[PDB]
Symmetry: C4
Subunit: 188 residues, 4 copies
């Protein structure tokens, strides 16, 4: 109630502000570039910003859903529970930077780093979801599905993290499709 409802309320606000801050990274094309190539070729060349904004928005929504699900189940709060949640908020607000980094350097040669730090923050959040839930355990079917799912995540985002080093396109691809899949298995 107050102990858990206050924490879940605060977390909901920080999630909302993180999600909406994503738009700011999308920068209107400069007057110079549009003057030489046309506003259209410019707004088009902005496609990885759209891509990064979109997949990152989507993934953060999934995080809001999972966060609410965990919070509905048990009402005891621990000191370390409060702080594991606090890190989770921290990585959520941090997501805009790897997003912006990724949109800025997706086409360019050192893109593999951009992709890796991106999948990094996502894997890192996944690990933190997993640890956050691990503290609670230590509806049977919901608990089981949740334990099973949060142990299923960090590995797959580790797969995205590792895939980054081989090629950018493959890593960003598995983050997009992985956002669709995790959205689907998240149970709204």
């Amino acid at each position: 109630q107050s102990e858990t409802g206050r924490i879940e309320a605060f977390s909901d606000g920080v999630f909302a502000i993180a999600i909406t801050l994503l738009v700011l990274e999308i920068k209107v094309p400069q007057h110079k570039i549009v003057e030489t190539v046309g506003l259209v070729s410019s707004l088009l060349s902005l496609w990885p910003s759209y891509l990064a904004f979109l997949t990152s928005f989507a993934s953060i929504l999934v995080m809001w859903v999972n966060h609410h699900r965990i919070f509905s189940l048990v009402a005891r709060t621990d000191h370390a529970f409060f702080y594991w949640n606090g890190l989770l908020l921290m990585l959520v607000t941090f997501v805009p930077f790897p997003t912006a980094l990724l949109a800025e350097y997706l086409i360019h040669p050192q893109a593999r780093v951009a992709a890796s730090v991106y999948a990094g923050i996502f894997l890192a959040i996944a690990i933190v979801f997993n640890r956050l839930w691990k503290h609670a355990a230590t509806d049977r079917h919901e608990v089981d599905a949740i334990t099973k799912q949060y142990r299923f995540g960090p590995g797959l985002y580790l797969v995205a993290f590792a895939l980054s080093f081989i090629s950018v396109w493959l890593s960003v691809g598995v983050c997009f499709v992985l956002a669709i899949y995790f959205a689907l298995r998240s149970n709204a």
Copy 2:
């Protein structure tokens, strides 16, 4: 009831942050340009920013009203409903960008491009409203009146969308007046 109030709550917060973010697009006039021509002529030359901010703020407010209106009616959320809602939040958080583009390039020659994407995203938002509401449809006369309103919008924004190609001024105007019209018809 409580779960729909939770999803509606998150959506209302994303609206508050989106609407307030709009102010950031209005850029204080540069020291150089103001230095040769004067603060007054500069703050005046900023008028398309005033215009885009005002119409975009007013319209997003109307979208908030309509969102709440849909949400009050029935308390049964599906995954697909939650996601129609989620995509709706994404286009709302995205609105500041077409806003900024429109303020920046209104006076300039490829303005029509900006204008269309402006009406474009709004048309897109209208469409998602419809789809979201269409999933609900599947006091009944009021529901019918709402279906008629949300079906009357997107065609008209295809018109505001299409008007963009003929001339910037006529399309953006039709977005101004059309925002006011939906403000009233939406009935607070």
Copy 3:
């Protein structure tokens, strides 16, 4: 209760974001300038940014107090009340831009343009408070004291507004004193 709690709530969130965005206008001193003159003289020359951030923050807080008092006392709501409230939100979210102008050009020659546009937006918000409440008529002692304060405000901000033309220092001064005064009269 629910209707004014919902409208008042949404306006409450938009207020918090307007207030906090103020911090973004304070811009850390650039590397080129700080290298020639030293970090202290630069952070010092930023003083009108501190000044505008401070008074505007105070001002938006007092406006938050007034908002909550109006909403708490009577719960009946009209469409036209909702829209006076909407314009009131629009001017509130707009506050950061004139804050930024005022902070930027306080030292420089056309400061009087900035100061007048500043006192302007505050006067305008005052007028909109007045009109929002006027539509309410169209605790009785609180009603009387409130109407007397809302008569007293817009005239005094017209005094600050007109003072802007004679000298920047005097207009900004009456805005600072006026924020402390209205804070003392809102009676939180």
Copy 4:
């Protein structure tokens, strides 16, 4: 209850926005610098940004919890208590600026000015918490511990603050350890 609950609600929203605004100061490295030296050396050279962001995020979380503790214990609003809380919101919204100043100039020679303005805002918040809570004096067992801790902070941040003048490294360091420590003593 309703006035303290509403006031606490507004204060918490300002906290959430302050904390998330923190990300914007981490600026994705410019195209030029990355093009001569490589993305990795650039993302690494950004580490004082990660440092200032991390310590400020953690510290602001702590201020959120301590704010919540003061508010839950006694619920009776005065004007002057409302204003002490108001100043406390202002400094919290001000936290991003000293954070960016600190991230930007940690490596540089006059870092000591940045560092001292950093610990300065933090100590200043400590003082404001101290007076905020002292407004209560002018269950019981907890009240004693809180007065001891709140009288206990501002001196220790005076220590971090004085430490800035001897060396940047010691000042920011003791702010780091001080953020972790106050997290634990706050009994989250």
